[PDB]
Design a protein around this nucleic acid. Structure first.
Lengths: 129, 122
RNA sequence: UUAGCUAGUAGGUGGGGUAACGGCUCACCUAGGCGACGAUCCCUAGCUGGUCUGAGAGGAUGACCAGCCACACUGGAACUGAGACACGGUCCAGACUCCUACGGGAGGCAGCAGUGGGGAAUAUUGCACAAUGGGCGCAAGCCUGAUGCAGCCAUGCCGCGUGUAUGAAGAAGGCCUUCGGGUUGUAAAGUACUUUCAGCGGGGAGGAAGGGAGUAAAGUUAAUACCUUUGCUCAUUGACGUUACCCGCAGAAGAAGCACCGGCUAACUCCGGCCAGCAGCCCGGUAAUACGGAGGGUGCAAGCGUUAAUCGGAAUUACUGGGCGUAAAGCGCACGCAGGCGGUUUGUUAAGUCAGAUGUGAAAUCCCCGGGCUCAACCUGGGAACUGCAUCUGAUACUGGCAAGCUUGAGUCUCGUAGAGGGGGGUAGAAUUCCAGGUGUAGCGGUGAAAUGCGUAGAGAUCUGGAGGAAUACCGGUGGCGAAGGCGGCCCCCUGGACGAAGACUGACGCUCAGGUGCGAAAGCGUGGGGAGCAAACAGGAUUAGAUACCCUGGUAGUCCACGCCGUAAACGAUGUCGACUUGGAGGUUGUGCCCUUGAGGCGUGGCUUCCGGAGCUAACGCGUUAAGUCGACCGCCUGGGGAGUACGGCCGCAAGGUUAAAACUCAAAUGAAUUGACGGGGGCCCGCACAAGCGGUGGAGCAUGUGGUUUAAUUCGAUAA
RNA sequence: AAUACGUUCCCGGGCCUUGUACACACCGCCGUACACCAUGGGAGUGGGUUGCAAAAGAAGUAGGUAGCUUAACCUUCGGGAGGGCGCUUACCACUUUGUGAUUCAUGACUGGGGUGAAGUCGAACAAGGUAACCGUAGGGCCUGCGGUUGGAUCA
RNA sequence: GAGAAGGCACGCUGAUAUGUAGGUGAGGUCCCUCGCGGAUGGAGCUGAAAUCAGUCGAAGAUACCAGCUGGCUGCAACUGU
C-alpha cells in the first residue's frame, strides 16, 4: 500500500520530468507543501497550487530550460524503512554544493545550507541535484 | 538484502580455508620421510617428479616435493618442509633444500639460496 | 545439526551473618523467575587503551608499554592481618622428585639467569644499588634479579662506511660476432689525493641530587645546650667505563652480497631434448630470452629471497557499496500470530531527532607546531584528537505515544452480469471390448518387410439383442473461471470468488509476514470395490554385431470410485506480494452510459486478457502501463565448478522417501547471451558421366609394368590427390 | 555408334536459412578393471570431558559436651566464671560404585567421491538418428503417467 | 522395554498432638408435611503417615516369608496345546 507519500511525490516529479509533462498533480499534504515550497524557492519547479478542501490536490508546475529537465536527479534519503538524521556538522551537500538537500529541522523544512547557517540538523528528506 | 533482513541476520564473512593446513600457521614443519618415490605429472606435462611422503611432528602425513636436480633422500630421513604446491595433484608442500637432512643441489651457481648451496669460494 | 531452563530456584516475613546491601545463610509462606531481543547447553577465548591494514566504513588482532582481572605443582580450607583465603606463608589430600640410621623428613622457577624436553624459533647461571622507586630506620644506613646498565642475536627501524679524482684508442682475458667489430668498460692497471668507521696511543663532559663534618643566623626554651630550618666552608659519593665526544699515527689499506631478466614486471644473447628440470597465475618431443651454465643487464643492498600469517586490491557478504527471466539466487500457492512499515487534520507530550552547557572519555600511542640527541630512528614541551556515554536546559519540522477527528486506502449493504470455480446426485448419445444368435467364406491382424497372434472348432465383414466401464466429438477460440495445483456432455441440490451502475454506511479497521497452519498435477502407498480401453513390470515375434530398446502380438500393477497417507514436478511467466507514476497501435472477452439507437452503428467509461512497439532498462536476448522503466514496504533466496541438495543428526512418513543440511578433498575454471565459421541421418533452390538411359571395360586367364611384403651382401632413394 | 524420360536416390560442389554442448571445427562426449587421496557406514576397541543417584569424610570452620587439664578475672580460699585438649555433629576436597550423554582415535568388511598423456564394453550435443529434460514408479539408460519448451521441420 | 539397571530410608522411646490428619458419632439444639425423619452439634471411640529429638545392637524389610542381574544371538510373533 501507500506507505511513503513523500517518495511518491519525488517519483511523480521525476516521471513527469522524464515524460516532458507540463505539470504533475498529486494528493496534497502539509509536508508535501513544505517540500514543494523548498523546491520552488530554490528554482527547481515553476509554481505550485493546492486545490480542494476535503481532498486537497497539490499541483506542481515542472520547469525546463533547453527542452531539458531542470531536476536532473531527485532521491529519497530518509525513508520509512530506514530513517536518516544528521547533525549540523555532518549535513550533506549534493553535487558539491550545486545541488540541495531538503532537511527537516526543528524550525521547519529547509535546505541543507539554510540549516547549516541556522546551526541546525535534522532529518534528510531528499537530495535534489 | 533489506535492512531489516540484515538486522535479523547480518552478513556472514566468507571464511578462507588454508592451502597448507599441515603447517598449522607455521612457516616450516619437520617430518620423517615415510616413502620416497616418483610420480607422473598431469595431462600436458610429462616427467617423473621426485616426491616423498612425510609424517610431520604434529602427526600429519603429507606428500612433499623435492626440488632441484638429484637428491639423496631415503626412508626415515628427517627433512624440513615448507608451503608451496606443485601444479602434480595432491602435492602441496616443498622440501627445503639444505635443511638438516636434504643436501643442497650440487653444481648450482644461480639461485643458490633457494636450494641451500654454499657460495663457491674463488 | 543445542528450545526449553530453574527447588535456594523467584519473592516475602522473621532469626543469623558480613566492614557493608543482598538467598549471603536458615525456618516458614507465597509460586514464581529466565527464555525466540537466543534462556539452557556445546566449542573457543583473558578484557581494554591500543597494533596492522583501509580513502573511509570496516576486517584482523590484543607481543612489547600502561590500566583491570585470574592464577602460583593439582584439589580444598582457613589463620594472621588495615588489606590474602597469601609465587619465594600455614594445614590437609594427590602425583612426582630427593635425604634417611627405615622410625621419619624435605620441595614446588608461570621471579632473575640457567638446565633437560617440545618446537621452524627466541638470549648471560654478568655488574651496581651510582640514578629513579620501594621496605625498614630519627638518621647514618641495610636489603632490593624492581630498576640502571652491560653480554648474545642483522629480529626490526634509522644512520654511516666498504674510498675519491684522473685514467684508453678502449690493454689482457671473458662473452657475442654478419669475423668488420661490439660489449664487459674509466671498469681495471697506472697516477694524484683522502682517512669517516674499524686498529693503536693521549685527553675527556653529563647522567650527581645528595649525604658527612664544621661554623654563623633564626625559631624553641627558663638556657647563649639539644633539636628544626636557613647560608657559607672543607673532604667525598658512577655499575655503565677504556663512556659520549675530541686529538694524534699508519696505510686503500680491514669491509658486497642476494634475487630476478616469456607476459603480468624493470632487465637478453650463446651453449648442453616432454628427459633432466622450472612454475605465484597463464615452458621443456634436437637453433628453449621460461630448464641448467656463462656473458650482459635489472632491482634491492648489510642485506637479499622463500615460507607462514593479517588487511588491501575483493563492489568477492556490497551499512557506505551487489544481486535473483536465461549466468548462483522468487518458497508450488495461499491464510495468518510475533515482527517491520503505514493515508490525512488538529491539539498535547518531548521518547527518537536536533541545539547549547557541564561532567567524564587515565597516561602512552595517532596527528600538528617546536625543542634535544652531529642527522635520523629515538626522546620530549604544548596543542589537537579521543568521532563515545551520562546529566541539565531548550526546539517541535519529521518519526513515536496519547486524545479527537476526516474520507481518498480498506471493508458492509442495494440491483444485476459472465464463467469447464468447488462438492453431491441423476441422466444422454457416439465409440471400443465382451456375450448370444442370423447371413456368409478364407482369410484377418500387423509391419519398412515380416513374424508372433486370431481363423475351416467358421475368424475378419455385416445385421440384431444384451452387459460393463471410462471419457465427454462438433461448440472449442495465443476463449472463460480459480491463490496455485487445476476445471470441458446435459439436468437438479448445496456453495465460494470476481466485476459493473447509482447511492448509503463504518471510519485507517491497512500492506507484508520468520515460526505456524491449510490447499497442493502425476506417479506411489493402505483398506474396500470396480476394471471396457490404454498400459510400467512380464512373455513371445522381429531388427541388430549384441537389442535387457525403439517396431509388432498380448498383458499385471496402475489408470476409475470411497476414505486416509504421500507433499514432490521444467509445481514456469524459469519473473514474491501490495501500492503510486510514465508516449502508443491492433485485437479478444465481460459489464455499463449517451445519441432520428439508422443498422450486426458511432461515441465514452470500468474489469480481465493476447500480439507488436516508443522512452527507459539490459551483457545481450529481450521486457516495455499485465515492465525486466521510476520508486516505496515487507518477505524468501544467492556468494566459483564438482563433492552435493549428498553424509551425519533432528522432524515428518506405513513405506517409497520428503524437509533442514555440512565437511575433508579436488580444478582453474564452470556459466549466460550474442558473433564468424564448420557440421546435421533440418528446410528451400541449383549444378557436375553424380545418379538414371546406354556402350565398352576392370575384378577371372597369360604376359608387361609399378608397388607392398618377403628374401638378399645389396635388392639405392623418394612418392601412400601414391 | 547407343542413350539421356528425368533429378526420386548415391557422391561432390554453390547460394540462402535454421539448431548446436563442435572450433586441429562430426575423422568434433556419458556411465559400469588399476594406482593414490580424503570420506560415510561398521561387530566392536581405547581415551578425553561431562550429567544423574549414591557411598566416602583428611584438614579446616561452626554448634554441643558429663572425660582430662587450666596464669591474669571474682571468691567465703572450699571453689567459681571463662579458656584449652579430647569426643561428637554440620559442611566439604580426594577417592569408590552404577548408569547415561558427547567428542576424538581406531576397526575386519563395505558404500560412494575425487584425481591419474596411455585399459575394456557400449546415453547427450544436429530432428544426435526413439526430441530433450523435470517429478515419480518398475526393469551390465529403457518404459509407463503427468508436465515444460530450455524441441527441429512444416508445398 | 521396566520391578530395567542403581541407590537411600526402615527398630524402640519421646515430642509435635496428655492420640495428630482421617474415620465414626452420643447428648444437646432446631425444624418437620412426624418418622427407622431432616439440620446443627460435637462428647466418646478408633486412628495412620510424617518430621524432630533421643536411644540399643555387629546387624531394625532382623525370624518364617520373599525377583539374581546385564550383554550378544538362533527359532517361534504373542496367551495357549
Amino acid at each position: 500500500s501507500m506507505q511513503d507519500p513523500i517518495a511518491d511525490m519525488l517519483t511523480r516529479i521525476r516521471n513527469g520530468q522524464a515524460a516532458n509533462k507540463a505539470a504533475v498533480t498529486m494528493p496534497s499534504s502539509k509536508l508535501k507543501v513544505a517540500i514543494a515550497n523548498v523546491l520552488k524557492e530554490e528554482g527547481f519547479i515553476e509554481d505550485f497550487k493546492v486545490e480542494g478542501d476535503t481532498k486537497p490536490e497539490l499541483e506542481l508546475t515542472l520547469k525546463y530550460f533547453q527542452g531539458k529537465a531542470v531536476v536532473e536527479s531527485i532521491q529519497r534519503v530518509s525513508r520509512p524503512g530506514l530513517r536518516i538524521y544528521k547533525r549540523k556538522d555532518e549535513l550533506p551537500k549534493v553535487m558539491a554544493g550545486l545541488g540541495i538537500a531538503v532537511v527537516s529541522t526543528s524550525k521547519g523544512v529547509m535546505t541543507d545550507r539554510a540549516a547549516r547557517q541556522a546551526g541546525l540538523g535534522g532529518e534528510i528528506i531528499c537530495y535534489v541535484a | 538484502a533489506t535492512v531489516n533482513q540484515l538486522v535479523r541476520k547480518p552478513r556472514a564473512r566468507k571464511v578462507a580455508k588454508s592451502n597448507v593446513p599441515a603447517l598449522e600457521a607455521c612457516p616450516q614443519k619437520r617430518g620423517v620421510c615415510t616413502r620416497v618415490y616418483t610420480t607422473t605429472p598431469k595431462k600436458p606435462n610429462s616427467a617423473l617428479r621426485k616426491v616423498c611422503r612425510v609424517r610431520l611432528t604434529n602427526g600429519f602425513e603429507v606428500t612433499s616435493y623435492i626440488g632441484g636436480e638429484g637428491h639423496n633422500l631415503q626412508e626415515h630421513s628427517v627433512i624440513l618442509i615448507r608451503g608451496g604446491r606443485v601444479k602434480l595433484p595432491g602435492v602441496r608442500y616443498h622440501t627445503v633444500r639444505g635443511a638438516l637432512d636434504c643436501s643442497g643441489v650440487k653444481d648450482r651457481k644461480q639461485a643458490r639460496s633457494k636450494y641451500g648451496v654454499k657460495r663457491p669460494k674463488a
